[PDB]
Amino acid sequence: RFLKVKNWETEVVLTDTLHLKSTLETGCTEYICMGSIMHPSVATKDQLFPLAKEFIDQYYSSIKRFGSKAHMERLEEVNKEIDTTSTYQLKDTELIYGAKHAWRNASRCVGRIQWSKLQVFDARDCTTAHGMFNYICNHVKYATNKGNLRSAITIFPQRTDGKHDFRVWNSQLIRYAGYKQPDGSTLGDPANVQFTEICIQQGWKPPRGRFDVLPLLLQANGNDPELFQIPPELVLEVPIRHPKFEWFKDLGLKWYGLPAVSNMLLEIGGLEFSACPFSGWYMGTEIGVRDYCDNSRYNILEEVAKKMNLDMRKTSSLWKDQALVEINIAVLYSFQSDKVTIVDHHSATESFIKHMENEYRCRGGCPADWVWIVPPMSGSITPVFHQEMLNYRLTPSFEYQPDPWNTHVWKLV
Amino acid sequence: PRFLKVKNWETEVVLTDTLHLKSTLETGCTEYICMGSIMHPSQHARRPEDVATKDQLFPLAKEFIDQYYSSIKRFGSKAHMERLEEVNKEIDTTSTYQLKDTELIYGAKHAWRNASRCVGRIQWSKLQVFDARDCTTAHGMFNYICNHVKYATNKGNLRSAITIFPQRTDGKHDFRVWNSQLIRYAGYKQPDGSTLGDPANVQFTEICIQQGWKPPRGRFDVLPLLLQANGNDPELFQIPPELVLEVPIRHPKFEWFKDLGLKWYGLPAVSNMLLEIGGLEFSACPFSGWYMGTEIGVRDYCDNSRYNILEEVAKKMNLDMRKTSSLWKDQALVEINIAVLYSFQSDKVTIVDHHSATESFIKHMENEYRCRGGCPADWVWIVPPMSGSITPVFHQEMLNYRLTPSFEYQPDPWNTHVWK
Numbered sequence: 096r097f098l099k100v101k102n103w104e105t106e107v108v109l110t111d112t113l114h115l116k117s118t119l120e121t122g123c124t125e126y127i128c129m130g131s132i133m134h135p136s137v138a139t140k141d142q143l144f145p146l147a148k149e150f151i152d153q154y155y156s157s158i159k160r161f162g163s164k165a166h167m168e169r170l171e172e173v174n175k176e177i178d179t180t181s182t183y184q185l186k187d188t189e190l191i192y193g194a195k196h197a198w199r200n201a202s203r204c205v206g207r208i209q210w211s212k213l214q215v216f217d218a219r220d221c222t223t224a225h226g227m228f229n230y231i232c233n234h235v236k237y238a239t240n241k242g243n244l245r246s247a248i249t250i251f252p253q254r255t256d257g258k259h260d261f262r263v264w265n266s267q268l269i270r271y272a273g274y275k276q277p278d279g280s281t282l283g284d285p286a287n288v289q290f291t292e293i294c295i296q297q298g299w300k301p302p303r304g305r306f307d308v309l310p311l312l313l314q315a316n317g318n319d320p321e322l323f324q325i326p327p328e329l330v331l332e333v334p335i336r337h338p339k340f341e342w343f344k345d346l347g348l349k350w351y352g353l354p355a356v357s358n359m360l361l362e363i364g365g366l367e368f369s370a371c372p373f374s375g376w377y378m379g380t381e382i383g384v385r386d387y388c389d390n391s392r393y394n395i396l397e398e399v400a401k402k403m404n405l406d407m408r409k410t411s412s413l414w415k416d417q418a419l420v421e422i423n424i425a426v427l428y429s430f431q432s433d434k435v436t437i438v439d440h441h442s443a444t445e446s447f448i449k450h451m452e453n454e455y456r457c458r459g460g461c462p463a464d465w466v467w468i469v470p471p472m473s474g475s476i477t478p479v480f481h482q483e484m485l486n487y488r489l490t491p492s493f494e495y496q497p498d499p500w501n502t503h504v505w506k507l508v
Numbered sequence: 509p510r511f512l513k514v515k516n517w518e519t520e521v522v523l524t525d526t527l528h529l530k531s532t533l534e535t536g537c538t539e540y541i542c543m544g545s546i547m548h549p550s551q552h553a554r555r556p557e558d559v560a561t562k563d564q565l566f567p568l569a570k571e572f573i574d575q576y577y578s579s580i581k582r583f584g585s586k587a588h589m590e591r592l593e594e595v596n597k598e599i600d601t602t603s604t605y606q607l608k609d610t611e612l613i614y615g616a617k618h619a620w621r622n623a624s625r626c627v628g629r630i631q632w633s634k635l636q637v638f639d640a641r642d643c644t645t646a647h648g649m650f651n652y653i654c655n656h657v658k659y660a661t662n663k664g665n666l667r668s669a670i671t672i673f674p675q676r677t678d679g680k681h682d683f684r685v686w687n688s689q690l691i692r693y694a695g696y697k698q699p700d701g702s703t704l705g706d707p708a709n710v711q712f713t714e715i716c717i718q719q720g721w722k723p724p725r726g727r728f729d730v731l732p733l734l735l736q737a738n739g740n741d742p743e744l745f746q747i748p749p750e751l752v753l754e755v756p757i758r759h760p761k762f763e764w765f766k767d768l769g770l771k772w773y774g775l776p777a778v779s780n781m782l783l784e785i786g787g788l789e790f791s792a793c794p795f796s797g798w799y800m801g802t803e804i805g806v807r808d809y810c811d812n813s814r815y816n817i818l819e820e821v822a823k824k825m826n827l828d829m830r831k832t833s834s835l836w837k838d839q840a841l842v843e844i845n846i847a848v849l850y851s852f853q854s855d856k857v858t859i860v861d862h863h864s865a866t867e868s869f870i871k872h873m874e875n876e877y878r879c880r881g882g883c884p885a886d887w888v889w890i891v892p893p894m895s896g897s898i899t900p901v902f903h904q905e906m907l908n909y910r911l912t913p914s915f916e917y918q919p920d921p922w923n924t925h926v927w928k
């Protein structure tokens with residue numbers, strides 16, 4: 096079997112064979128498509144054996160040693176550990192490879208042209224929340240690199256019995272607090288009101304401002320999580336100004352330079368790494384469209400349009416559209432002026448298409464989630480909009496997991 | 509699966525879908541692969557090839573009649589059981605059957621209602637249906653189409669309509685409108701190698717010239733109709749210009765915008781699709797409504813393989829066009845779409861912006877889950893091609909499935925037509 100995807104802007108046709116090697120479901124059926132569902136859908140010995148064999152087989156194929164003496168010894172060895180300890184340990188090489196291919200297989204990530212330049216930080220010797228904080232500070236300092244951002248991931252010990260998970264309770268390493276006021280308004284980031292509340296309850300003393308970097312809430316070995324303040328000199332931030340509108344800086348807007356997702360699960364050969372924060376650099380629309388202009392977020396369209404004296408009486412004036420562009424210009428100009436790595440949605444989508452074509456050529460395909468790949472503004476004037484894409488799930492993979500406060504059984508009376 | 513929920517992530521409203529349990533044919537997807545962004549994911553058709561056998565066409569016919577009579581509070585009534593026996597005899601004798609007026613009107617309205625990719629389906633029950641099943645010649649088809657265009661344009665107050673020509677019989681007697689839309693502009697290959705007018709239509713334009721059309725070779729030459737009746741060679745007709753409502757495109761602040769010399773037509777009238785009812789195939793069924801501004805302002809004007817006017821607009825705007833991060837493309841894009849909306853509204857020609865339209869479709873989804881238990885929607889098509897996440901449908905999960913009656917794509921007739 097083969098499957099073809101077409102680009103309707105260029106008429107290039109690519110041929111996907113890679114999809115024959117997927118195994119978990121997409122959520123779709125033969126008669127319903129669920130491609131716009133945000134979230135559709137511990138292993139025993141018997142379950143873990145084929146998953147591990149699959150990953151060891153593919154690792155040894157990648158390094159052109161399939162069938163080798165070392166491949167067969169490794170399988171034997173992995174299998175002893177699963178027999179003995181009901182789990183196994185990855186070699187460093189396997190860990191690095193698995194982490195890179197989890198990124199390579201992330202169908203919703205438009206930045207995957209960079210997948211093989213991932214700095215893997217092995218933190219599987221960590222045993223405490225203090226330890227995790229140390230590991231995470233070093234990640235932040237390395238990744239941030241004074242504005243010249245570098246891709247990086249820090250991998251904490253894998254799940255065991257489900258009762259000793261390592262977790263970063265934060266959704267990202269750097270995020271701003273949100274506070275709901277008695278009058279119903281919201282200060283800061285409305286997305287983070289719940290996590291802000293858990294922080295305050297755990298003992299965080301909030302300054303209660305618009306851009307309070309939240310504390311880290313770190314859980315090691317199934318214990319209660321603990322609070323740590325990131326050293327402020329490690330949180331690189333960019334004040335948002337506009338190259339034309341002198342008044343823009345008066346909005347008091349700023350954002351952090353480092354996007355670092357910390358709530359996902361890294362799955363490699365059946366092993367579950369439940370704490371594995373990873374970071375790259377921003378595409379501008381993530382800030383200027385979603386973070387700033389989602390109605391459920393900082394929601395600054397009306398403010399910005401006001402200062403543009405746009406006619407906000409009718410929607411067909413496209414005042415929101417006009418204000419959205421200017422905000423996103425300001426984001427890109429601000430990061431660039433401060434020499435903090437950022438990519439605009441045109442460059443990023445163009446690069447993703449080159450990456451996708453190369454992946455079809457060298458690998459037999461590239462799973463891609465159109466719904467997520469297309470930027471949230473100016474969709475059809477980017478090339479990915481006109482690109483057909485096959486979405487399927489390959490492993491190693493990044494996966495969502497339950498928020499830890501919906502699951503954690505608290506220790507301290 | 510037993511019942512499927514969709515959630516809106518901006519409002520947290522969750523809807524529960526059972527209508528999908530009536531899905532008939534494959535989406536293209538599997539448990540293991542999703543084809544949500546494939547333009548034509550599936551070739552699963554409900555009847556095969558040409559004249560089907562009775563065991564092939566009757567079950568489809570029986571299904572649609574069953575659905576139609578359920579819709580009107582019968583099922584099992586005298587009329588329902590008589591109609592089955594009637595279609596049964598009719599297929600036994602002619603290898604086809606004919607729809608009652610009521611069944612035709614019901615079927616067209618429900619094809620629109622089931623069109624997962626259509627953002628405008630709040631209007632679905634307000635559809636004027638012109639029965640043209642007595643047509644026999646391309647001259648007849650021209651008469652019917654002209655009336656359609658005139659009724660639907662209605663001096664700018666556009667009305668939704670569909671005109672249904674005779675169904676397919678053996679596949680060698682098809683009625684086809686060879687135009688993809690009733691009204692489009694020509695596209696000319698230039699001697700240097702660029703393109704004048706609309707590049708999408710270069711091939712169809714060449715067929716027209718090859719058929720004897722005399723191109724004015726302008727940027728906005730309305731194309732002739734190329735009408736095929738009862739399988740015969742297609743015939744050219746010029747739509748009377750007084751029936752083709754056009755809007756000159758100007759900007760409410762940029763006075764220089766008018767001098768780009770852009771216009772568009774007022775009536776979007778899709779004419780190359782196939783309407784499928786009870787196993788019957790209406791290969792010629794031009795339908796029309798009114799534009800979402802983005803269709804002209806984003807896709808028609810700004811696609812790289814269409815009119816591609818972004819750099820020329822940006823130039824006039826004095827934008828930094830050195831680097832993509834200046835977002836000059838995005839900035840011109842907004843201004844063009846302001847211009848299109850301003851122009852249509854100034855000339856009292858029906859048009860809807862993408863904000864109003866996506867909001868309407870959220871309301872329509874809610875209605876459909878209330879009364880019907882679901883609403884098939886294609887997120888890739890529903891979300892506007894600009895300012896996606898600031899329209900409410902971006903944040904709305906959708907379930908996509910194929911309900912019948914439907915509109916379907918079909919081969920371009922020149923790929924399949926043996927000339928005479």
Ligand code: HEM
Pocket residue numbers: 194198201203204205206207209213246247248373374375376377378381438443467493
């Ligand atoms: C190097 C620069 C990178 C860029 C420009 C980039 C860009 C993006 C963007 C814009 C999104 C959508 C985010 C959203 O809409 O919320 C995304 C998603 C994602 N990225 Fe990347 N990314 C980068 C690096 C990485 C790295 C280093 C990893 C993992 C090692 C990664 C894994 C993912 C995953 C798993 C998703 C989707 C999350 C999900 O399934 O919900 N990305 N990326």
Ligand code: HEM
Pocket residue numbers: 620623625626627628629631635668669670795796797798799800803860865889915
């Ligand atoms: C009344 C105003 C209407 C509006 C505002 C509207 C809006 C739209 C838009 C924006 C699209 C996507 C177009 C594209 O990107 O090419 C679309 C697709 C479609 N519309 Fe509607 N529409 C309207 C009326 C109708 C009517 C009357 C019918 C049929 C009787 C219809 C059937 C369809 C179908 C079948 C498609 C998708 C075809 C495909 O699958 O490619 N629409 N609509």
Ligand SMILES: C[C@H](O)[C@H](O)[C@H]1CNc2nc(N)[nH]c(=O)c2N1
Pocket residue numbers: 103480481482483484544545546547888889890
């Ligand atoms: C590849 C992709 O499916 C294709 O470009 C689609 C995307 N979404 C679309 N949405 C609409 N409304 N119209 C289109 O033509 C398309 N094209």
Ligand SMILES: C[C@H](O)[C@H](O)[C@H]1CNc2nc(N)[nH]c(=O)c2N1
Pocket residue numbers: 131132133466467468517902903904905906
């Ligand atoms: C309902 C819909 O699936 C949801 O809003 C998705 C749409 N596409 C997206 N695409 C990206 N990159 N990020 C998102 O959060 C979303 N949200």
Ligand SMILES: Cc1cc(N)nc(C#CCN2CC(F)(F)C2)c1
Pocket residue numbers: 206354355356373374375376377378381
């Ligand atoms: C590594 C990375 C790079 C980037 N440029 N952006 C993101 C992001 C994000 C936040 N959302 C939540 C999610 F679903 F995980 C993606 C992550």
Ligand SMILES: Cc1cc(N)nc(C#CCN2CC(F)(F)C2)c1
Pocket residue numbers: 776777778781795796797798799800803
């Ligand atoms: C009735 C209608 C209304 C509208 N506002 N727009 C369209 C459209 C279109 C053009 N494309 C070709 C297609 F694929 F059929 C859709 C159709």
Ligand SMILES: [Zn+2]
Pocket residue numbers: 123127128129130537541542543544
């Ligand atoms: Zn799907």
